[PDB]
Amino acid sequence: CTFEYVSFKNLREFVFKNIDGYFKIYSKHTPINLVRDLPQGFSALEPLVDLPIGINITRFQTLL
Amino acid sequence: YNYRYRKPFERDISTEIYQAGSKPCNGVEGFNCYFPLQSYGF
Ligand SMILES: *[C@@H]1O[C@H](CO)[C@@H](O[C@@H]2O[C@H](CO)[C@@H](O)[C@H](O)[C@H]2NC(C)=O)[C@H](O)[C@H]1NC(C)=O
């Protein structure tokens, strides 16, 4: 508890990775025509945050 | 007694016993079963 911080026709994309105690987040957002599968094409995700937290992540879960 | 020792930039405060022996120590201290923290005699 030693760290704390504050700041279907749409597709949100994200990347999460943890390296040498820093946790990094990237994203991209767009409208879309077809909602059941990922749209065939290309655009690149860009950074959001980089957290100095030091934790040993092996699992994750979504919140609805 | 407050000052104690047990990847890069890791931190870990977990209290689970060192199972130094072949014994599954299951929270009980004894020969080769020890609490993970030791204190500097400052
Ligand atoms: C994640 O957990 C592992 C154990 O599951 C930690 O491993 C220890 O890491 C140090 C690094 O210097 C080694 O000297 C120890 O020998 C490792 N222990 C064992 C039993 O292999 C690891 O440090 C943890 N990583 C983070 C980022 O917290």
Q: Which of B11, B9, B10, B18 is nearest to B37 (CA)?
A: B18
B5's tokens:
């020792």
What's this structure's resolution in Å? 3.2
**Beta strand spans in chain B (E):** 4-5, 38-39
Please tell me if residue B9 touches chain A, with a CB cutoff of 8 Å. Answer: yes
CB A46 within 8 A of CB A27: yes
Chain B contact set for A56 (CB, 8 A): 10, 12
Radius of gyration, CA atoms only, chain B = 12
Question: Of the candidates B36, B28, B41, B39, which has an alpha carbon nearest to the alpha carbon of residue B4?
Answer: B39
Reduced to 3 states (helix: H, G, I; strand: E, B; else coil), residue B3 is: coil
Query: Which of A17, A18, A20, A56 gets mutated to test ligand 1 (max ligand atoms within 8 A of its CB)?
Result: A56
Method: cryo-EM
